Design a protein around this ligand. Sequence first.
Ligand SMILES: [Mg+2]
Ligand SMILES: [Mg+2]
Ligand SMILES: [Mg+2]
Ligand SMILES: [Mg+2]
Ligand SMILES: [Mg+2]
Ligand SMILES: [Mg+2]
Ligand SMILES: [Mg+2]
Ligand SMILES: [Mg+2]
Ligand SMILES: [Mg+2]
Ligand SMILES: [Mg+2]
Ligand SMILES: [Mg+2]
Ligand SMILES: [Mg+2]
Ligand SMILES: [Mg+2]
Ligand SMILES: [Mg+2]
Ligand SMILES: [Mg+2]
Ligand SMILES: [Mg+2]
Ligand SMILES: [Mg+2]
Ligand SMILES: [Mg+2]
Ligand SMILES: [Mg+2]
Ligand SMILES: [Mg+2]
Ligand SMILES: [Mg+2]
Ligand SMILES: [Mg+2]
Ligand SMILES: [Mg+2]
Ligand SMILES: [Mg+2]
Lengths: 52, 102, 134, 51
Amino acid sequence: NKSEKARSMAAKVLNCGKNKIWLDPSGKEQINQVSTREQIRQLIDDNVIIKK
Amino acid sequence: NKMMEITVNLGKLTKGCNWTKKASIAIKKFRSHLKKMLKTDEKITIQKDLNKYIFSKGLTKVPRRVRIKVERIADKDNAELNVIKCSHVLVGNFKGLKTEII
Amino acid sequence: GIRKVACIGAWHPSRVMTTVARAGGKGFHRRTEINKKVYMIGHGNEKIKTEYDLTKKFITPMGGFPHYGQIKNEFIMLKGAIVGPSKRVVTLRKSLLKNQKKNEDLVIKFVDTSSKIGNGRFQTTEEKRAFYGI
Amino acid sequence: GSRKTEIIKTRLVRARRSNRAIPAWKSELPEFKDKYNMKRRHWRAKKLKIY
RNA sequence: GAGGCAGUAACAAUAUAUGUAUAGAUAUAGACUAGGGUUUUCAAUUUAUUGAAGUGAAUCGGUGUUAUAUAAAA
RNA sequence: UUUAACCGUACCUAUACCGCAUCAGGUGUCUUUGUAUCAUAACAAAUAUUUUAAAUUAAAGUAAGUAAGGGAAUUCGGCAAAUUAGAUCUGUAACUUUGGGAUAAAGAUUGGCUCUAGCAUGCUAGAACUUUUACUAUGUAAGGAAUCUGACUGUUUAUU
RNA sequence: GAUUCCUACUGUCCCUACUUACAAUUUUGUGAAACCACGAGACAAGGGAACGGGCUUGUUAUUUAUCAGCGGGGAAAGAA
RNA sequence: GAUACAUUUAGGAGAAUACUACUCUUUUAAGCAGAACUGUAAGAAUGAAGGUGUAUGCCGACAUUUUGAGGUUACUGCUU
Ligand SMILES: [Mg+2]
Ligand SMILES: [Mg+2]
Ligand SMILES: [Mg+2]
Ligand SMILES: [Mg+2]
Ligand SMILES: [Mg+2]
Ligand SMILES: [Mg+2]
Ligand SMILES: [Mg+2]
Ligand SMILES: [Mg+2]
Ligand SMILES: [Mg+2]
Ligand SMILES: [Mg+2]
Ligand SMILES: [Mg+2]
Ligand SMILES: [Mg+2]
Ligand SMILES: [Mg+2]
Ligand SMILES: [Mg+2]
Ligand SMILES: [Mg+2]
Ligand SMILES: [Mg+2]
Ligand SMILES: [Mg+2]
Ligand SMILES: [Mg+2]
Ligand SMILES: [Mg+2]
Ligand SMILES: [Mg+2]
Ligand SMILES: [Mg+2]
Ligand SMILES: [Mg+2]
Ligand SMILES: [Mg+2]
Ligand SMILES: [Mg+2]
């Protein structure tokens, strides 16, 4: 359950707040293996991590 | 196995409680009300769209009446035990509606 | 605080006397009062007619008594206030005193039957529908 | 406070090094089987007085 | 070193049958200096313990001049 | 152009400072969106945090409201609370160190909609129609007549 | 700044009544201090260091071992 | 103290309640009706001191009719 690492890193990439990020519970498996900035930018394009 | 439909007004149940917590009290009084009717003492569970409708005005105010449907389902812990689930039913005008058995 | 008594006792005697006022429970006591006059004796199902009215009516007001309902039995009607709330046992007995003073007769003109819930303006149900005209 | 002189940084580096527990390779020896450090400090409790 | 008073005074206590979400609730927020000194980041075990990694300057501060015989990080 | 040396560059602005503490106290400078016909006050954005006992029923407390008739009779003393208040137009006394007193005191007007009339073109006068009548959610002077003392603006026993 | 009188105004008063929130009354968790010669039930009079809880003659309480209030007394506690 | 009887519970309601205790008990709650409180709902049509200009067309505070209407049950009684 590495949810807190995803919320904080994705806030830096888009220059946005933490409360606007919406994770997707369907793609639960892919988020537990993130470690780089590069893997996040593919997750935004697949609309697993979207902005409110 | 038969289903029910009841109309329950929360303005009668929550008359004269402290208004700082009127929505949150209206859930606990709602649970003890159906234990009065149904004699069975297993449990009473609430669907999420029913819970969201009660908190629609805020903590201080509670809407007047609501229309519900009640059924008995199986438990998520033991297969042979049971539990009771409640769900919301949309209706505009409450005049003339009686409790029916599906 | 304000709603209290200031001094309880003096120095000597160095105890608190039983005559002072002290806070405690109230109500549900037993009382007994005398000299209540009897005005009317009858039955609830019957209609009571006087001389000074033209209409005849029952004893139960419109919408019933509050928290009671209707009267379907024999009853008594007496003057004044009576101990206790509604729907509780009340014991009636004869008087101990003798040499009661003679008075004159009792002439009852009419008995009221309006609704006791709100401000009621009508006596019977026929006066209500003749007013609005259905 | 991100503006230090030369002496303040050299003293602060040495004070970080001395706050450590006993290493694990020494604790297996018979001399230091149950012995533990007593001169540790906490950064919120006690202050270092360096200025 | 250990009693009575005493588990007494005094403080803390949001909703959901399936949830990395749907709602409720309180508080304006962000940068330089003085002070603090590894609290930073990550991994493993449960505002803790141990172990690694992390601070890059010709043009951003000091090092220069003086305040009528030791003075400026505005 | 193997020319431009030496030192600091992580992080916290208050649950990462000082008050023996995860203390309702204290601490230099700057920046910060929208409605708001003088402003103020207030609300919303932005951003950051947060999980599960009971209740139409005590007494006496700490706060906030309302009151028939009388109106300071309570009390050392009108202590506490209440009344007045914005803006436009009339009107303004005794006294005087001739500057003031004075915003003295005392009256009248105030919404919404449809137009007319000026020129400076967004400000000001007037008219007709209509209603359970208009600064009042927030903010906003009680007034008058005398006596003792200090000329005035200013300062003082950090903690009676 | 200190003092007296008129007008308006009002629960200051005659004489108090009603409603709401937070603490209190009921439950779970963390969990102290002042004070303590002995206190094992309480009074009337007496003498006594001339105002007794205990001494001397008299009159008297008692719910299976409680709970919530109150400020008469312990010449109540603080400070040679 | 006398005369009868016993080794006598669980869940709800209030005329009873700080927690205990008390008075009663097998029917819970919707919808109608009786009886009341507020004072005329939304929508629709017809008007309106006027104003624009041609489209018998747009913009108008408010008024009348549908309407003693609409809404609610800290009082009694019916029905499934
Ligand atoms: Mg109440
Ligand atoms: Mg420094
Ligand atoms: Mg508390
Ligand atoms: Mg660490
Ligand atoms: Mg840096
Ligand atoms: Mg930095
Ligand atoms: Mg600061
Ligand atoms: Mg500190
Ligand atoms: Mg603080
Ligand atoms: Mg209460
Ligand atoms: Mg009055
Ligand atoms: Mg009056
Ligand atoms: Mg007087
Ligand atoms: Mg007097
Ligand atoms: Mg005053
Ligand atoms: Mg006008
Ligand atoms: Mg002076
Ligand atoms: Mg002083
Ligand atoms: Mg409370
Ligand atoms: Mg004695
Ligand atoms: Mg004597
Ligand atoms: Mg006690
Ligand atoms: Mg001495
Ligand atoms: Mg009793």
